[PDB]
Design an enzyme around this catalytic site. Sequence first.
Site, PDB file in Angstrom:
ATOM      1  N   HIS B  41       0.837  -1.232   0.000  1.00 45.95           N
ATOM      2  CA  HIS B  41       0.000   0.000   0.000  1.00 45.95           C
ATOM      3  C   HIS B  41       0.863   1.270   0.000  1.00 45.95           C
ATOM      4  O   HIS B  41       0.269   2.364  -0.060  1.00 45.95           O
ATOM      5  CB  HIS B  41      -1.093  -0.018   1.088  1.00 45.95           C
ATOM      6  CG  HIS B  41      -0.685   0.305   2.490  1.00 45.95           C
ATOM      7  ND1 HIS B  41      -0.420   1.613   2.915  1.00 45.95           N
ATOM      8  CD2 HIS B  41      -0.567  -0.476   3.585  1.00 45.95           C
ATOM      9  CE1 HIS B  41      -0.116   1.597   4.204  1.00 45.95           C
ATOM     10  NE2 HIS B  41      -0.234   0.329   4.640  1.00 45.95           N
ATOM     11  N   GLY B 143       2.487   6.645   9.172  1.00 45.54           N
ATOM     12  CA  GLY B 143       3.816   6.469   8.553  1.00 45.54           C
ATOM     13  C   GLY B 143       4.717   5.491   9.299  1.00 45.54           C
ATOM     14  O   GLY B 143       5.791   5.166   8.740  1.00 45.54           O
ATOM     15  N   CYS B 145       3.847   2.553   9.445  1.00 45.83           N
ATOM     16  CA  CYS B 145       3.692   1.384   8.549  1.00 45.83           C
ATOM     17  C   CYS B 145       5.059   0.920   8.086  1.00 45.83           C
ATOM     18  O   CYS B 145       5.910   1.770   7.791  1.00 45.83           O
ATOM     19  CB  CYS B 145       2.892   1.680   7.291  1.00 45.83           C
ATOM     20  SG  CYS B 145       1.140   1.743   7.666  1.00 45.83           S
TER      21      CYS B 145
END
Lengths: 306, 306
Positions: B41, B143, B145
């Site tokens: 993603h 962020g 992630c």
Amino acid sequence: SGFRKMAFPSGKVEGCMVQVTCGTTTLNGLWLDDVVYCPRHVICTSEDMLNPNYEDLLIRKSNHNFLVQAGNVQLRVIGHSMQNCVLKLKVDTANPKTPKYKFVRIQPGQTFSVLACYNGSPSGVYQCAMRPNFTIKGSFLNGSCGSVGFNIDYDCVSFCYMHHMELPTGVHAGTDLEGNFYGPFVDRQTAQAAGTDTTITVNVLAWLYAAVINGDRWFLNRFTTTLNDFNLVAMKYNYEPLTQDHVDILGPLSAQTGIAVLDMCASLKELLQNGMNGRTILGSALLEDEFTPFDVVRQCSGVTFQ
Amino acid sequence: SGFRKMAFPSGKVEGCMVQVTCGTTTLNGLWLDDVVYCPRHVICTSEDMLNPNYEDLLIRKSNHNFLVQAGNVQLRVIGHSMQNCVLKLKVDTANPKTPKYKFVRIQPGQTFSVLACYNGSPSGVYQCAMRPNFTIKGSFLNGSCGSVGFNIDYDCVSFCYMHHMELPTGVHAGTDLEGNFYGPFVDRQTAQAAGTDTTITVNVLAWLYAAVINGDRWFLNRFTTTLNDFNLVAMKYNYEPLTQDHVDILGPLSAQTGIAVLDMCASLKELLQNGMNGRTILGSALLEDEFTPFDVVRQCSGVTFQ
Ligand code: NA
């Protein structure tokens, strides 16, 4: 989102950990430039520890009586000196992994990370607070002495703690990196009173701000208070008095949440007088005091290092 | 002595963290040999997250759409490939700091450390459990992630988790390093139900043994139970059923303390039914389930890594 007790990444500190052996005693040392720092009681047997004369014990030791190992590299000792309760072993090699660093003496109520070490090797990292009574509630076994506590600000490691002893009460005492104990403690296996400990009020408030930011708001009430009124309650519940300096430190969190510090004091007051009624805040059934206002801002803004 | 929620030393993992930017989206990647692993993603805008066709979205992307920063150096992407929910970005340079590593798929109830990162920069480290419902209660900001979870065995880093998603309910979902989600979750910004969570029974028992080893013994009693009768009560309080496999795993802690597993279960049974009634265990006002039996043994005997 979410809120966790978070340690600093330990890599810059891992690169500095060494093993120090003197006669039959092995503990951990910190290797920065061409100096190894470790607890002076590396020169003691457990017999010596009941009443050590460090000056006379050290006069028996030469440079070659100190074995220093960094992983598999033997370091050569070319000088030794005692500064307060730390030994400084001059070695013939600069640590190539020396990070940018400072030695700092932290204030009670400040937090830091501990890299727990045995035989110069890392076992784990955890966050804790310097209690108002200058103890820490650590995880330290036989051989953990010389393990250090630190903060990291971008690329700079501030070393603030070296571990020296477990008190009979099972709490932990140690020094700054100049070898000065936090609190009244001494490097002698003896009965030693820690202060009456108190709760770090400004830290509890910071964590109530953390809770609001994460959507925990049940404890927000329609009361306010004054500093002097709140402080009568703090004294009753063995909480540190709150000063205007503490209010000023909380200001950015006040600004974010729209909750004036004295309103958040009124909330804390109701929690102290009424308990929590078996409810939780940020997954805790107790009021947490091991997060500073700076720790809450750091975790809520997303600050980083390297 | 003392018992803390301890994370693994993070140095080996810090040397593998990089920043991956694709258009407006930046998150963290893991650089092992000449591959950078990150959430797929990264190729999505917030707008795309509502219903992404990853295959179609990956087709529109060129190597040079992937900006990869390892500190001050920019890595050159020479390959892009999709494995389940992870992107593998092939780069022209192998990571010289690549540790000995494995990829492993962990079981619900097992623990690991998370190196929380923002824009490729390590910010902190914490120990968590994979919930029985395959969520983690983490601390993850916009962020974060791409941040990974791992264990260390001697010298080998076992990567078990990559963070992908913050669920609307505020818990966290992610994949193994082959890109398979833990639990029923998908990399789509959508309402997703997590299962009913349960308390990790074998972990709570492990932590009661840690309490006894550290001198907290008030919850012990002279009551017995069968596995079957303990489980009838655990069922009532949303505790995972305890199996023989679980009793066997706790044996070394039974052996050290001289407290039979089923005797400790008789203790836990009493604790669920009558609560803790204002008392604490290892400083906690709740029963802790984020320590495995293995975590307690390695903290209590001072296991180290190199
Ligand atoms: Na968790």
